[PDB]
Write an enzyme that holds these catalytic residues in place. Structure first.
Site, PDB file in Angstrom:
ATOM      1  CB  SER A 195      36.431  19.103  40.623  1.00 49.25           C
ATOM      2  OG  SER A 195      36.885  17.895  40.036  1.00 49.25           O
ATOM      3  CE  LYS A 245      32.085  21.978  38.581  1.00 52.45           C
ATOM      4  NZ  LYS A 245      32.843  20.855  39.186  1.00 52.45           N
ATOM      5  CB  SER A 275      35.863  20.780  36.771  1.00 51.47           C
ATOM      6  OG  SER A 275      35.150  20.084  37.775  1.00 51.47           O
TER       7      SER A 275
END
Ligand code: ZN
Lengths: 467, 83
Positions: free
Chosen positions: A164, A65, A140
């Site tokens: 997330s 990420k 996210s």
RNA sequence: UCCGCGGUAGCUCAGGGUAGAGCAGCCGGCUGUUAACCGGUAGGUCGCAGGUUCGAGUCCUGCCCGCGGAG
């Protein structure tokens, strides 16, 4: 499939270089449409893939990420403020994977600063769900999930603050673990809510999660909040209770979509034929936790994102005046960020601190308490990761509707408990997920339980081809 | 319970300059959000187990690598507009 | 200092088109009232000083005062 690859590699059947070339191609051909990766590990991949031996993770490549620091690679955090930032240091978690033969494929797309639940708040571009190009991959960590489901990568790293990591994993039909707060290091995580943030693993199989955690987790002298608890994950060589007590949370039973209720009932039948004592329990103030979260998290976020003026490393907005420059540079934030840090400033602002922050703090302590009490009568907790499957782009116009995406996932972070999100069916070609909880530090137990479920069935699919 | 004045005050404290269009927009959002949060019930409310770091030196960044992050540098300094 | 409610008869509070009602006051009625009540009547710096409006107690700018609240 991850452990399968390392197997073929160790037997000389394949070389790490071969595996990279394979995945790199797949990305170059599928990512354009998917939009999972923001950055890619340049020549430094092929070069690094031909200078390794027979370590545990040799042939493996990981998708990280883009809010996790990787030395020498562009770490944007999905923001304009950092769209050219490249860290001179490496995140402890990532560093550890690297020392065991692993390599970074690229950096994953996310909502700006991790604040988002659909990837529609990435400063660069949205990410598409491999199961349906018309629907979001969640957020996210939407990018990491999307990458896994399309076999763009064997392993993946995400970030969880209010789900997330779990919510995206559910939407994309893969595994996502949020480790007990303190298990994995936060050093190198461009985090937004310090008390709630945690790097979480994600993969297409539970055995793979074990690989990541066993490598990534562990005490770090640089993180003062890290726990001194040896991973010991890969001991999923089951001597598993039989007979664990499983507690279903009533509050999270109503309001679910057909496919979620259906997937839930079926899972219970499975855990029972496994030797578990399924019973309904009560998480009294769980439904009111969403509120406490959106006052505690924004609070810490305002203070964490305060550092992003154009002085030392961000983008410079061009003011020529400094106060004006700082003010103009921060204007480069997105609508969602601004919204949250404005809330955060208010909650901590004079005259409102005790009335809000102090209030939400006391409430956060209740949840931990109610949880302690629940794990005195049960060994595991079960609820949906989300009331519905991935939604189509465009919905969630009301900022609130977006927040309510993390209705069931906020409890984990607010308390600190480990939470695993595992695939449990489909609401018509759409992956629906269920969420397992365990007491503090018993990460390995819920993974073990997850294995039993996984083995008891084989229910996981890939939207795109897998190499 | 949120006046346009408070927004101004808040955007001041946060050093965030938003357009008059965004102001009118965020003004509506913040209202709804602050109402949702305010619904939080009040409730009545650990051991210190923190650790300390030894006073042992750890290698620093080379000046080159540090200044490479700077949007503006000058003779080994980070350069910013004047006060 | 900031913030949030207040300032209207004497007293306590009602509310973009004569500024009102009950308490007491005045006049009239009533031999058992307990905060008597019935009718009639008198009573004003709507906070103060500046604006919008044909018209401002009502809306909007500044200030004075009171109460309450913040680590
Ligand atoms: Zn230092």
């Amino acid at each position: 499939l991850a452990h399968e690859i390392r197997a073929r590699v160790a037997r000389g059947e394949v070389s790490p270089l071969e595996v990279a070339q394979a995945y790199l191609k797949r990305v170059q051909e599928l990512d354009p449409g998917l939009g999972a990766f923001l950055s890619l590990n340049e020549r430094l991949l092929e070069e690094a893939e031909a200078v390794d031996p027979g370590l545990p993770l040799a042939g493996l490549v990981v998708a990280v990420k883009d809010n996790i620091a990787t030395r020498g690679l562009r770490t944007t955090a999905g923001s304009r403020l950092l769209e050219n930032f490249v860290p001179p240091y490496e995140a402890t978690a990532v560093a550890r994977l690297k020392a065991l033969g692993a390599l970074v494929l690229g950096k994953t797309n996310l909502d700006e600063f991790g604040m988002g639940s659909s990837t529609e708040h990435s400063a660069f571009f949205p990410t598409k769900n491999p199961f349906d190009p018309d629907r979001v991959p969640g957020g996210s960590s939407g990018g990491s999930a999307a990458a896994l489901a399309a076999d763009l990568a064997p392993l993946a790293l995400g970030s969880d603050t209010g789900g997330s990591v779990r919510q995206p994993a559910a939407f994309c039909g893969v595994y996502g673990l949020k480790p007990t707060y303190g298990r994995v290091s936060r050093f190198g995580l461009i985090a937004y809510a310090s008390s709630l943030d945690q790097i979480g693993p994600m993969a297409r199989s539970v055995r793979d999660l074990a690989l990541l955690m066993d490598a990534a987790a562990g005490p770090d002298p640089l993180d003062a909040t890290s726990l001194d608890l040896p991973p010991r994950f890969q001991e999923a060589l089951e001597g598993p209770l039989p007979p664990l007590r499983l507690g279903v949370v009533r509050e999270a039973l109503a309001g679910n979509s057909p496919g979620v209720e259906r997937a839930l009932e079926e899972a219970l039948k499975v855990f029972r034929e496994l030797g578990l004592s399924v019973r309904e329990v009560s998480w009294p103030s769980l439904p009111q936790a969403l509120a406490a979260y959106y006052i505690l998290a924004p609070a810490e976020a305002s203070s964490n994102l305060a550092r992003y003026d154009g002085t030392l490393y961000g983008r410079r907005a061009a003011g020529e005046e400094v106060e004006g420059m700082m003010e103009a540079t921060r204007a480069l934030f997105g609508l969602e960020v601004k919204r949250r840090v404005l809330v955060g400033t208010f909650v901590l602002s004079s005259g409102y601190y005790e009335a809000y922050y102090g209030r939400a703090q006391a409430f956060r302590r209740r949840l931990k308490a109610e949880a302690q009490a629940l794990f005195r009568e049960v060994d595991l907790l079960l609820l949906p990761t989300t009331p519905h499957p991935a939604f189509p782009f465009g919905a969630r116009r009301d900022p609130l509707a977006m927040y309510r995406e993390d209705l069931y996932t906020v409890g984990a972070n607010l308390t600190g408990l480990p939470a695993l999100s595992f695939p449990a069916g489909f609401e018509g070609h759409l992956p629906v997920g269920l969420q397992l909880l365990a007491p503090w530090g018993e990460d390995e137990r819920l993974l073990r339980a997850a294995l039993a479920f996984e083995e008891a069935t084989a229910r996981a699919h890939l939207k795109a081809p897998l190499g | 319970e949120l006046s346009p004045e408070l927004l101004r005050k808040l955007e001041t404290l946060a050093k965030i300059r938003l357009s008059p269009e965004e102001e009118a927009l965020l003004l509506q959002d913040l209202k709804r959000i602050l109402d949702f949060v305010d619904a939080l019930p009040r409730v009545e409310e650990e051991e210190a187990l923190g650790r300390l770091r030894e006073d042992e030196p750890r290698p620093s960044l080379p000046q080159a690598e540090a200044l490479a992050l700077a949007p503006e540098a000058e003779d080994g300094f980070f350069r910013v507009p004047p006060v």
